[PDB]
Design a binder for this molecule. Structure first.
Ligand SMILES: [Zn+2]
Lengths: 89, 273
Protein backbone atom coordinates (compact mmCIF):
# COMPACT_ATOMS: atom_id res chain seq x y z
CA UNK A 1 0.00 0.00 0.00
CA UNK A 2 2.92 2.39 0.54
CA UNK A 3 6.68 2.47 -0.14
CA UNK A 4 9.21 4.90 1.34
CA UNK A 5 12.48 6.07 -0.21
CA UNK A 6 15.18 8.08 1.56
CA UNK A 7 16.80 10.19 -1.16
CA UNK A 8 20.51 9.93 -1.83
CA UNK A 9 22.97 11.05 0.79
CA UNK A 10 21.36 8.78 3.34
CA UNK A 11 24.58 8.93 5.35
CA UNK A 12 26.19 12.31 5.97
CA UNK A 13 29.04 13.66 8.10
CA UNK A 14 29.28 17.30 9.16
CA UNK A 15 31.08 19.49 11.70
CA UNK A 16 29.39 21.05 14.76
CA UNK A 17 27.43 24.17 13.84
CA UNK A 18 26.49 23.13 10.31
CA UNK A 19 23.00 22.57 8.90
CA UNK A 20 22.10 19.17 7.43
CA UNK A 21 19.14 18.10 5.27
CA UNK A 22 17.64 14.65 4.62
CA UNK A 23 14.84 13.96 2.12
CA UNK A 24 12.09 11.34 2.16
CA UNK A 25 9.48 10.48 -0.50
CA UNK A 26 6.92 7.73 -1.01
CA UNK A 27 4.66 5.94 -3.47
CA UNK A 28 1.18 5.39 -2.06
CA UNK A 29 -1.84 3.52 -3.35
CA UNK A 30 -4.02 5.93 -1.34
CA UNK A 31 -4.40 9.69 -2.09
CA UNK A 32 -3.77 10.90 1.45
CA UNK A 33 -0.47 9.86 3.03
CA UNK A 34 2.03 11.41 5.46
CA UNK A 35 5.83 11.36 5.84
CA UNK A 36 7.21 11.91 9.36
CA UNK A 37 10.81 11.91 10.64
CA UNK A 38 11.86 10.77 14.14
CA UNK A 39 14.96 9.38 15.82
CA UNK A 40 15.37 5.62 16.20
CA UNK A 41 12.57 3.91 18.18
CA UNK A 42 10.28 6.89 17.52
CA UNK A 43 12.57 9.15 19.54
CA UNK A 44 11.75 12.86 19.75
CA UNK A 45 13.48 15.11 17.19
CA UNK A 46 15.94 17.78 18.40
CA UNK A 47 14.31 21.17 19.01
CA UNK A 48 16.59 22.61 16.31
CA UNK A 49 15.04 20.23 13.79
CA UNK A 50 12.42 21.25 11.24
CA UNK A 51 10.31 18.48 9.63
CA UNK A 52 7.69 19.03 6.90
CA UNK A 53 6.65 17.39 3.62
CA UNK A 54 9.31 14.71 4.03
CA UNK A 55 12.16 17.19 4.42
CA UNK A 56 14.19 17.03 7.65
CA UNK A 57 16.48 19.99 8.31
CA UNK A 58 18.65 20.07 11.42
CA UNK A 59 20.23 23.47 12.04
CA UNK A 60 23.31 24.30 14.13
CA UNK A 61 24.16 20.61 14.61
CA UNK A 62 25.29 19.32 18.00
CA UNK A 63 27.35 16.21 18.74
CA UNK A 64 24.25 14.75 20.43
CA UNK A 65 22.42 14.91 17.08
CA UNK A 66 24.56 12.04 15.77
CA UNK A 67 22.65 8.83 15.14
CA UNK A 68 20.06 7.06 12.99
CA UNK A 69 16.89 8.85 11.84
CA UNK A 70 13.72 7.17 10.55
CA UNK A 71 11.19 8.38 7.98
CA UNK A 72 7.78 6.79 8.42
CA UNK A 73 5.33 6.73 5.52
CA UNK A 74 1.67 6.20 6.39
CA UNK A 75 -1.85 5.95 4.93
CA UNK A 76 -5.16 4.36 5.93
CA UNK A 77 -3.92 0.96 4.70
CA UNK A 78 -0.34 0.60 5.96
CA UNK A 79 3.04 2.04 6.95
CA UNK A 80 6.63 1.75 5.73
CA UNK A 81 10.00 2.98 6.99
CA UNK A 82 13.40 4.04 5.68
CA UNK A 83 16.52 5.24 7.52
CA UNK A 84 19.25 7.86 7.32
CA UNK A 85 22.37 8.33 9.45
CA UNK A 86 24.23 11.40 10.74
CA UNK A 87 27.84 11.57 11.91
CA UNK A 88 29.34 14.59 13.69
CA UNK A 89 33.05 15.41 13.46
CA UNK B 1 -22.24 -1.74 37.40
CA UNK B 2 -18.89 -3.16 36.31
CA UNK B 3 -20.04 -6.77 36.65
CA UNK B 4 -22.59 -5.89 33.97
CA UNK B 5 -20.88 -3.30 31.77
CA UNK B 6 -17.11 -3.79 32.03
CA UNK B 7 -17.08 -4.18 28.24
CA UNK B 8 -17.87 -0.46 28.04
CA UNK B 9 -14.32 0.24 29.18
CA UNK B 10 -11.11 0.07 27.15
CA UNK B 11 -9.23 -3.22 27.50
CA UNK B 12 -6.40 -1.05 28.82
CA UNK B 13 -8.60 0.41 31.57
CA UNK B 14 -9.94 -0.42 35.04
CA UNK B 15 -13.61 -0.34 36.05
CA UNK B 16 -14.86 0.96 39.40
CA UNK B 17 -18.35 1.03 40.91
CA UNK B 18 -19.96 4.01 42.63
CA UNK B 19 -23.27 4.87 44.28
CA UNK B 20 -24.94 5.96 41.03
CA UNK B 21 -22.80 4.04 38.55
CA UNK B 22 -19.37 3.02 37.29
CA UNK B 23 -16.50 4.82 35.55
CA UNK B 24 -13.48 3.68 33.50
CA UNK B 25 -9.84 4.72 33.91
CA UNK B 26 -6.75 3.95 31.80
CA UNK B 27 -4.09 1.87 33.55
CA UNK B 28 -0.51 3.02 34.17
CA UNK B 29 1.50 3.87 31.05
CA UNK B 30 -1.63 4.53 28.98
CA UNK B 31 -3.48 7.83 28.44
CA UNK B 32 -7.12 8.57 27.68
CA UNK B 33 -10.50 8.74 29.41
CA UNK B 34 -11.02 5.09 30.34
CA UNK B 35 -13.37 4.32 27.44
CA UNK B 36 -10.49 4.92 25.01
CA UNK B 37 -6.79 4.50 25.89
CA UNK B 38 -3.47 4.55 23.98
CA UNK B 39 0.08 3.64 25.07
CA UNK B 40 2.40 6.47 26.08
CA UNK B 41 5.02 7.43 23.47
CA UNK B 42 3.23 5.51 20.72
CA UNK B 43 2.51 6.58 17.11
CA UNK B 44 -1.20 7.08 16.36
CA UNK B 45 -3.18 7.59 13.15
CA UNK B 46 -6.45 9.43 12.50
CA UNK B 47 -8.61 8.68 9.43
CA UNK B 48 -11.85 10.02 8.00
CA UNK B 49 -13.73 11.59 5.11
CA UNK B 50 -14.12 15.23 4.11
CA UNK B 51 -16.98 16.86 2.19
CA UNK B 52 -17.38 20.50 1.31
CA UNK B 53 -19.52 23.12 -0.43
CA UNK B 54 -17.35 26.23 -0.64
CA UNK B 55 -17.82 29.52 -2.49
CA UNK B 56 -14.46 31.10 -3.42
CA UNK B 57 -14.07 34.87 -3.59
CA UNK B 58 -17.16 36.36 -5.23
CA UNK B 59 -18.27 33.21 -7.05
CA UNK B 60 -22.00 32.43 -6.97
CA UNK B 61 -21.34 28.75 -7.74
CA UNK B 62 -19.60 26.68 -5.06
CA UNK B 63 -16.85 24.09 -5.44
CA UNK B 64 -18.24 20.78 -4.18
CA UNK B 65 -16.31 17.71 -3.14
CA UNK B 66 -17.30 14.52 -1.34
CA UNK B 67 -15.46 11.36 -0.32
CA UNK B 68 -12.15 13.22 0.06
CA UNK B 69 -9.71 11.45 2.43
CA UNK B 70 -8.07 12.86 5.58
CA UNK B 71 -5.07 11.08 7.12
CA UNK B 72 -3.21 12.38 10.17
CA UNK B 73 -0.11 11.09 12.04
CA UNK B 74 1.20 11.90 15.55
CA UNK B 75 3.47 10.37 18.19
CA UNK B 76 2.27 10.61 21.79
CA UNK B 77 4.28 13.14 23.80
CA UNK B 78 6.05 14.61 20.75
CA UNK B 79 3.45 17.32 20.16
CA UNK B 80 3.59 17.49 16.36
CA UNK B 81 0.58 16.69 14.17
CA UNK B 82 0.91 16.06 10.43
CA UNK B 83 -2.27 16.13 8.33
CA UNK B 84 -2.88 15.26 4.66
CA UNK B 85 -6.12 15.84 2.77
CA UNK B 86 -6.22 14.54 -0.78
CA UNK B 87 -8.38 14.81 -3.83
CA UNK B 88 -8.73 18.52 -3.19
CA UNK B 89 -9.50 20.50 -6.41
CA UNK B 90 -7.06 23.18 -7.58
CA UNK B 91 -10.08 25.48 -7.66
CA UNK B 92 -10.13 25.55 -3.85
CA UNK B 93 -6.75 24.15 -2.78
CA UNK B 94 -4.87 27.43 -2.55
CA UNK B 95 -7.76 29.27 -0.90
CA UNK B 96 -7.89 26.72 1.95
CA UNK B 97 -4.21 27.26 2.82
CA UNK B 98 -4.87 29.62 5.75
CA UNK B 99 -7.19 27.07 7.40
CA UNK B 100 -4.56 25.12 9.35
CA UNK B 101 -7.06 24.71 12.25
CA UNK B 102 -8.78 22.04 10.14
CA UNK B 103 -5.87 19.83 11.15
CA UNK B 104 -5.02 21.91 14.20
CA UNK B 105 -7.75 20.25 16.30
CA UNK B 106 -5.66 17.07 16.12
CA UNK B 107 -2.72 19.01 17.54
CA UNK B 108 -4.97 20.10 20.41
CA UNK B 109 -5.94 16.46 21.00
CA UNK B 110 -2.33 15.30 21.36
CA UNK B 111 -0.42 18.36 22.62
CA UNK B 112 2.52 17.79 24.98
CA UNK B 113 1.05 17.80 28.50
CA UNK B 114 2.79 20.13 30.97
CA UNK B 115 2.52 20.20 34.77
CA UNK B 116 -1.03 19.38 35.80
CA UNK B 117 -2.75 19.87 32.44
CA UNK B 118 -4.44 17.43 30.04
CA UNK B 119 -4.56 17.46 26.23
CA UNK B 120 -7.69 16.87 24.15
CA UNK B 121 -7.41 13.09 24.08
CA UNK B 122 -6.97 12.76 27.84
CA UNK B 123 -10.14 14.82 28.35
CA UNK B 124 -12.41 13.35 25.62
CA UNK B 125 -10.91 10.01 24.63
CA UNK B 126 -11.32 11.12 21.03
CA UNK B 127 -15.11 11.05 21.34
CA UNK B 128 -16.44 14.57 20.78
CA UNK B 129 -18.12 17.05 18.44
CA UNK B 130 -16.42 20.23 17.21
CA UNK B 131 -18.48 23.14 15.86
CA UNK B 132 -16.30 25.90 14.41
CA UNK B 133 -16.72 29.13 12.45
CA UNK B 134 -14.20 31.45 10.82
CA UNK B 135 -14.76 35.03 9.70
CA UNK B 136 -12.22 36.68 7.40
CA UNK B 137 -12.26 40.35 8.38
CA UNK B 138 -13.25 42.61 5.50
CA UNK B 139 -14.75 39.79 3.42
CA UNK B 140 -18.40 38.58 2.93
CA UNK B 141 -19.96 35.68 4.83
CA UNK B 142 -18.07 33.03 6.77
CA UNK B 143 -16.98 29.40 6.72
CA UNK B 144 -18.67 26.82 8.96
CA UNK B 145 -16.94 23.61 10.04
CA UNK B 146 -18.39 20.55 11.77
CA UNK B 147 -16.27 17.59 12.86
CA UNK B 148 -17.31 14.41 14.66
CA UNK B 149 -14.80 12.16 16.44
CA UNK B 150 -15.92 8.61 17.27
CA UNK B 151 -13.05 7.07 19.24
CA UNK B 152 -10.80 4.20 18.20
CA UNK B 153 -12.43 1.88 15.66
CA UNK B 154 -12.14 -1.87 15.06
CA UNK B 155 -8.87 -1.33 13.17
CA UNK B 156 -7.18 0.76 15.86
CA UNK B 157 -7.69 3.98 13.90
CA UNK B 158 -8.80 7.17 15.64
CA UNK B 159 -11.81 8.55 13.72
CA UNK B 160 -12.79 11.95 12.31
CA UNK B 161 -15.58 13.06 9.95
CA UNK B 162 -15.33 16.58 8.46
CA UNK B 163 -17.93 18.86 6.86
CA UNK B 164 -17.17 22.37 5.50
CA UNK B 165 -19.65 24.95 4.17
CA UNK B 166 -19.50 28.65 3.40
CA UNK B 167 -17.39 31.29 1.68
CA UNK B 168 -13.65 32.01 1.77
CA UNK B 169 -11.58 34.78 0.11
CA UNK B 170 -9.73 33.87 -3.10
CA UNK B 171 -6.01 33.16 -2.96
CA UNK B 172 -4.06 33.39 -6.26
CA UNK B 173 -3.15 30.12 -7.98
CA UNK B 174 0.40 29.15 -7.02
CA UNK B 175 0.61 31.47 -4.02
CA UNK B 176 1.85 30.32 -0.60
CA UNK B 177 0.84 31.17 2.99
CA UNK B 178 2.73 31.74 6.26
CA UNK B 179 1.50 31.54 9.86
CA UNK B 180 3.58 32.71 12.85
CA UNK B 181 3.58 31.07 16.33
CA UNK B 182 0.55 31.83 18.54
CA UNK B 183 -1.30 30.91 21.74
CA UNK B 184 -5.00 30.09 22.25
CA UNK B 185 -7.11 29.93 25.40
CA UNK B 186 -9.50 27.00 25.88
CA UNK B 187 -12.24 27.57 28.48
CA UNK B 188 -13.86 24.58 30.22
CA UNK B 189 -17.30 24.41 31.87
CA UNK B 190 -19.60 21.42 32.47
CA UNK B 191 -18.41 19.24 29.57
CA UNK B 192 -18.12 22.14 27.14
CA UNK B 193 -14.88 23.70 25.86
CA UNK B 194 -14.87 27.01 23.94
CA UNK B 195 -12.26 29.31 22.39
CA UNK B 196 -12.14 32.43 20.24
CA UNK B 197 -9.02 33.83 18.59
CA UNK B 198 -8.24 36.65 16.15
CA UNK B 199 -5.00 36.09 14.21
CA UNK B 200 -3.20 37.22 11.07
CA UNK B 201 -1.62 35.27 8.22
CA UNK B 202 0.62 36.27 5.32
CA UNK B 203 0.06 35.58 1.63
CA UNK B 204 3.13 35.36 -0.62
CA UNK B 205 2.49 35.91 -4.35
CA UNK B 206 3.21 33.20 -7.01
CA UNK B 207 6.91 32.33 -7.19
CA UNK B 208 7.58 33.72 -10.67
CA UNK B 209 9.56 36.58 -12.19
CA UNK B 210 8.15 39.86 -10.92
CA UNK B 211 6.39 38.42 -7.85
CA UNK B 212 4.71 41.34 -6.07
CA UNK B 213 5.15 42.20 -2.35
CA UNK B 214 3.46 39.96 0.25
CA UNK B 215 0.31 40.98 2.13
CA UNK B 216 -1.30 40.16 5.48
CA UNK B 217 -4.91 39.41 6.36
CA UNK B 218 -6.84 38.73 9.57
CA UNK B 219 -9.42 36.14 10.59
CA UNK B 220 -11.30 35.16 13.73
CA UNK B 221 -11.70 31.54 14.82
CA UNK B 222 -14.60 30.56 17.09
CA UNK B 223 -15.21 26.99 18.30
CA UNK B 224 -17.31 24.86 20.65
CA UNK B 225 -16.16 21.39 21.67
CA UNK B 226 -18.72 19.05 23.28
CA UNK B 227 -18.23 15.63 24.88
CA UNK B 228 -19.29 13.27 27.69
CA UNK B 229 -17.61 12.79 31.08
CA UNK B 230 -18.40 10.03 33.58
CA UNK B 231 -21.02 11.45 35.95
CA UNK B 232 -19.90 9.26 38.84
CA UNK B 233 -16.72 9.14 40.93
CA UNK B 234 -17.59 12.02 43.25
CA UNK B 235 -13.97 12.17 44.41
CA UNK B 236 -12.86 13.39 40.99
CA UNK B 237 -10.62 16.50 40.65
CA UNK B 238 -12.17 19.23 38.50
CA UNK B 239 -10.49 20.19 35.23
CA UNK B 240 -8.88 23.66 35.01
CA UNK B 241 -11.34 26.38 34.04
CA UNK B 242 -8.81 27.70 31.51
CA UNK B 243 -5.87 26.03 29.71
CA UNK B 244 -3.41 27.58 27.27
CA UNK B 245 -2.41 25.97 23.98
CA UNK B 246 0.97 27.11 22.63
CA UNK B 247 1.42 26.58 18.88
CA UNK B 248 4.54 26.88 16.72
CA UNK B 249 6.40 25.55 13.67
CA UNK B 250 3.28 25.89 11.52
CA UNK B 251 3.52 24.81 7.86
CA UNK B 252 0.79 24.74 5.21
CA UNK B 253 1.08 23.54 1.61
CA UNK B 254 -1.02 22.65 -1.42
CA UNK B 255 0.41 20.57 -4.25
CA UNK B 256 -1.43 20.81 -7.57
CA UNK B 257 0.27 17.72 -9.03
CA UNK B 258 -0.99 15.29 -6.40
CA UNK B 259 -3.91 17.55 -5.46
CA UNK B 260 -3.05 17.27 -1.79
CA UNK B 261 -3.46 19.77 1.04
CA UNK B 262 -0.97 19.50 3.93
CA UNK B 263 -0.99 21.02 7.44
CA UNK B 264 1.66 20.58 10.16
CA UNK B 265 2.06 22.12 13.62
CA UNK B 266 3.63 21.67 17.07
CA UNK B 267 1.59 21.87 20.28
CA UNK B 268 2.01 22.17 24.07
CA UNK B 269 -0.81 22.49 26.62
CA UNK B 270 -0.43 24.10 30.05
CA UNK B 271 -1.16 27.04 32.40
CA UNK B 272 -1.95 30.59 31.26
CA UNK B 273 1.31 32.58 31.09
ZN1 LIG C 1 -10.64 1.90 10.56
Amino acid sequence: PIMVTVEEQRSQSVRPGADVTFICTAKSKSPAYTLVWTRLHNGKLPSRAMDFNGILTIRNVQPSDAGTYVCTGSNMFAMDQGTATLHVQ
Amino acid sequence: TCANNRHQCSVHAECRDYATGFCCRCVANYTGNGRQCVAEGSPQRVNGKVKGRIFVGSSQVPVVFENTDLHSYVVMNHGRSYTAISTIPETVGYSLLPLAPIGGIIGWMFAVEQDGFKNGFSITGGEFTRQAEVTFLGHPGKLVLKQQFSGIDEHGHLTISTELEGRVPQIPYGASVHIEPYTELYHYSSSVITSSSTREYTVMEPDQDGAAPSHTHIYQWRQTITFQECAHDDARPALPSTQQLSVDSVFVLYNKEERILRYALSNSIGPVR
